[PDB]
Amino acid sequence: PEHYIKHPLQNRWALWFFKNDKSKTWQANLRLISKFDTVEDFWALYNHIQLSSNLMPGCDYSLFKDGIEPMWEDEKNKRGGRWLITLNKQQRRSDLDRFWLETLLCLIGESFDDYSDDVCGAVVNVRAKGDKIAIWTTECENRDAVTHIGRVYKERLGLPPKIVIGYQSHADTATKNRFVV
Numbered sequence: 001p002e003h004y005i006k007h008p009l010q011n012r013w014a015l016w017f018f019k020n021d022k023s024k025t026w027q028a029n030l031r032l033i034s035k036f037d038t039v040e041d042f043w044a045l046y047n048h049i050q051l052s053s054n055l056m057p058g059c060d061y062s063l064f065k066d067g068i069e070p071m072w073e074d075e076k077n078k079r080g081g082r083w084l085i086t087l088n089k090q091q092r093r094s095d096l097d098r099f100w101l102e103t104l105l106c107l108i109g110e111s112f113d114d115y116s117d118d119v120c121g122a123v124v125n126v127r128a129k130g131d132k133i134a135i136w137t138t139e140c141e142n143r144d145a146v147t148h149i150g151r152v153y154k155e156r157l158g159l160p161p162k163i164v165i166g167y168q169s170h171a172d173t174a175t176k177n178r179f180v181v
C-alpha cells in the first residue's frame, strides 16, 4: 500500500488565479486553475506555477476548499472574515513567498486542530501598494474558532510579539478589526 499510493489530503482544494483586467468585472477575472486532493498532486501544481513574488501587480492566487468559491458572496464566506497579513513593499522579496507557502501548508495539512473546519481558504494579493495574505474563515462571530486559528497562524508564520495581526469580517470589507492576536 504505502509503496504506490499517493497520500490523500483531508480536503480536496482548488487553486484560483485572478488577473486585473479593466475590461472585465471582478468576478469575470477570477479563474479556476486546477484541483488536487493528494500531497503529491499539491506539489506537482505548486512546482509548476509562478511564485507569488513573480506575479504582475494586480494578480491574486486563492486556495479554497473544493466547493467554496473565493468570494464574499459564497454561502460559506458571506458571514465570515479573514486573518490579514499586511506586507510592506520590501517584504515582497523577503517574506511573501515563504509566508504564502506556509499558509498553503496550514490549510492542506489542517493545522488548526478542530477549528480547521472553520477555514474556507487563503488569498494572496500581489499589489504595488503592498502585498497581502489572508486566511478566510466561515463565521466571524465564532470567537474561539477565529482566535485559535489566528494564534496558530501567527506562530506558524513566525511573527514576533512586536507584531499584531487583525481579523476583519467580510461584511465590513464589502462596504475595522474584530479580533487581534
Ligand SMILES: C[n+]1cn([C@@H]2O[C@H](COP(=O)(O)OP(=O)(O)OP(=O)(O)OP(=O)(O)O)[C@@H](O)[C@H]2O)c2nc(N)[nH]c(=O)c21
Residues within 6 Å of the ligand: 026, 027, 070, 071, 072, 073, 125, 127, 129
Ligand atoms: C475579494 N473581493 C474583491 N472584490 C472587488 O475587488 C476590489 C479590490 O479588492 P481586493 O481584495 O483585490 O484588495 P485590493 O488591494 O486590490 O484593494 P483594496 O480595497 O484593499 O484597496 P486599499 O488597499 O484599502 O487601498 C474590491 O473593492 C471589490 O470591488 C470583490 N468583489 C466581489 N463581488 N466579491 C469579492 O469577494 C471581492
